[PDB]
């Protein structure tokens, strides 16, 4: 694991901030990008740009292909049977929506339950509470140990037969934690249940195999996979997709339009209403490419590493909390320190060069569970290194000191 | 004073050779080329200031924030709408469009209730109108338009009703060109109550806007047709009216409190940003839509006015031509056939000359069958093009006649 030429791929990492060097740890709420992935953006906007409807004309042709392409990669990368399980969104959060608008809402009615865990971010919350809201819908959460470990046995507790859908996450966002999701499907699916996966941090942190997971769903954030803003996936089984209304509409969703009705496309193009987003699906293949290149295995060892590194020299810091210890868990430190709020750390680390976040990170009910309503959040990515643990580690003591 | 000489110059893309022969990009109405800012911008986003943009404390965060809510500043500018707070950013018009369609149209029109459309819209102005048909029994109407491709106002009032609820209206069709007299249908809506949407992803790139002189309740347009880039839209609503709608889509930023028990939302336009936004095609519109005003709004509308009269010209000394759409005020759209070619036909030929026009729906069914055909070719002119590129397109043009005849 060559770390110091991975570094080298990412130009914004020798950049200084407050005169200082950058120590990036905020990578949980967005990562950076490859030169790679500049480079593709730039090309396709410089020289192979056109709308993508395969229009007969040589470049509308050649930005088919390479959107195309993309949808390829994705299917590649997340091990889906078919390209045409792939459906390009703005983002996660509107992938979750598509399901919860497509599915959820003809499906889910007065009574119904849609199960999820205490862990999830708002995003994989708020559309599920739409149906409550306006259908009479019953959100259950599934609970997690003062460890921050997920125990089966209490999700299968809360499965009923008025469950009609499980939307849960891959990876907490802030506990790190890794929900045990082949296990869950099973449980689900023998029931009927289809389950949506939230992956936004799976994707990013572990290697996913959506055949092999089962579920119906599962979505991803490009911008968290050192990809462009402005694009999501949805992964959905055909037959699920197939299910569902649409969620948006407009241009090249549709079969026919009259002024008397319209009759809808066939995924994954039934999802897709309007111009998606061309050079950021392009850009995004490219990110993928840079993950595969690296080696997906390669960076779950490196980011192990720098978790258990970081557990080590965070742990010897006197008055502070690590909120989720499960031993599988993806690299994400969420903590605290004993009478100092987190944007005091947050702020003032910042000065030393250290990004990380303070907040709820998208994840109230969480830290109201766990007692709280801020924490830090440190969450590694594979261009990160040791050194940046102790930097980190160094500007805490610091900051305790100062405050203390 | 109009350099498009030194204009094309700023677009990398326009010096490059398609089949070993020049370009001619004719295809604008679908996207445009994007100027060397632009992509500048973009890269310099991503390359220097990039983090994600909930006004985090840290260095990068702030500086994305700031790159980011200046664009919303630039796009407000550009629109003139009161307040930056009016402006929801999206995908695109497409689902700037739905999100009124679900946050406003679903809630307050029901069964029996009218949905006043014209003839000339693009599915993405049907489609989500249609849903609230389908599965809460609205009915949709639609203003006609003469056989010349003119908007007649008079029609437009007809068809106003105690039933109607909504209008939803281009404001520059993406097949005729036929501008439609926006002002004075919102003065007609207005007077009865009812709010106007207008779909302007094609007025936004062809014309002068002002939201407030037009007085619309809600504009859409989309990032890409304006030299910017892809996944990047805009939903401009009228305070009052954005505050009146119910969240579209749910989830982070768009909350004030989340609870296992229940949600409370954010207020506009946050209302209606979930999840991470499209931070660096909004940062990059903002350079498009600066790039417009170097330029100059009314220069680039007096050389696009050029460009449509001269194709008119010259394409209407082509003997078995006919053009959809002569309205006297229209945009630089032109959408034609050949007797007896069909339009793929004609479109794959001269993309061998290297001109770039698109043949098919245009996703403009109802408008396609109103005018008694199924597919026309469109050759849809921007600020970068030229006359030199409109004898191309003719002599293409004729040579693609002789060829099928
Ligand atoms: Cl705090
Ligand atoms: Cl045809």
Redesign the interface.
């Known amino acids: 694991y060559d770390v110091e030429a991975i570094r080298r791929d990412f130009?914004?990492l020798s950049?200084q901030?407050?005169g200082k060097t950058?120590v990036?740890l905020?990578n949980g709420?967005?990562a950076?990008?490859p030169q790679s992935?500049?480079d593709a953006?730039?090309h396709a906007?410089?020289?192979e740009?056109?709308?993508v409807?395969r229009?007969?004309?040589?470049?509308?042709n050649a930005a088919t292909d390479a959107y195309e392409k993309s949808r390829e990669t994705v299917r590649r990368f997340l091990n889906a049977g078919s390209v045409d399980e792939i459906v390009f969104?703005?983002?996660?959060?509107?992938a979750?929506?598509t399901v919860?608008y497509g599915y959820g809402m003809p499906f889910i009615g007065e009574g119904d339950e849609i199960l999820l865990s205490?862990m999830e971010?708002?995003?994989?919350?708020?559309?599920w509470?739409?149906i409550r809201?306006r259908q009479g819908a019953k959100?259950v959460?599934t609970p997690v140990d003062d460890n921050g470990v997920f125990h089966i046995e209490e999700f299968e507790k809360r499965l009923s037969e008025r469950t009609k859908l499980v939307a849960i996450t891959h990876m907490s966002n802030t506990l790190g934690t890794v929900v045990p999701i082949k296990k869950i499907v099973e449980l689900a699916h023998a029931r009927g249940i289809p389950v949506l996966v939230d992956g936004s941090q799976g994707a990013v942190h572990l290697p996913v195999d959506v055949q092999d997971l089962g579920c119906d769903w599962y979505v991803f954030?490009g911008?968290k996979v050192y990809g462009?803003?402005?694009?999501g996936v949805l992964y959905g089984r055909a037959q699920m997709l197939e299910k569902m209304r649409?969620f948006?509409?407009?241009?090249?969703?549709?079969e026919?339009?009259?002024?008397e009705?319209?009759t809808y496309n066939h995924p994954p193009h039934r999802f897709e209403?309007?111009?998606?987003?061309?050079?950021?699906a392009i850009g995004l293949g490219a990110a993928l490419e840079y993950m595969e290149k690296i080696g997906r295995h390669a960076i779950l060892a490196h980011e192990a590493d720098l978790r258990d590194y970081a557990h080590e020299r965070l742990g010897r810091i006197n008055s502070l909390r690590i909120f989720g210890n499960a031993p599988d868990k993806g690299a994400i430190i969420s903590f605290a320190l004993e009478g100092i709020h987190a944007?005091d750390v947050?702020?003032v680390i910042?000065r030393a060069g250290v990004?990380?976040?303070?907040?709820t990170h998208?994840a109230?009910?969480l830290l109201?569970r766990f007692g709280v309503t801020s924490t830090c959040r440190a969450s590694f990515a594979l261009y990160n290194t040791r050194a940046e643990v102790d930097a980190l580690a160094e500007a805490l003591e610091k900051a305790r000191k100062f405050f203390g």
Do not use: W
């Not at 969104?89 to 509107?94: H, I, L, Q």
């Open positions: 130009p914004i950049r901030v407050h950058l990036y905020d709420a967005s950076q990008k992935v500049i953006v730039t906007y410089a020289n740009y056109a709308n409807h229009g007969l004309h040589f470049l509308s969104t703005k983002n996660a959060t509107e979750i929506n919860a205490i971010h708002h995003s994989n919350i708020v559309p509470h739409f809201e959100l959460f954030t911008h462009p803003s402005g694009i649409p948006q509409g407009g241009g090249e969703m549709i026919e339009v009259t002024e009705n319209v209403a309007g111009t998606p987003p061309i050079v950021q944007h947050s702020m910042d990004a990380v976040r303070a907040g998208c109230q009910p109201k």
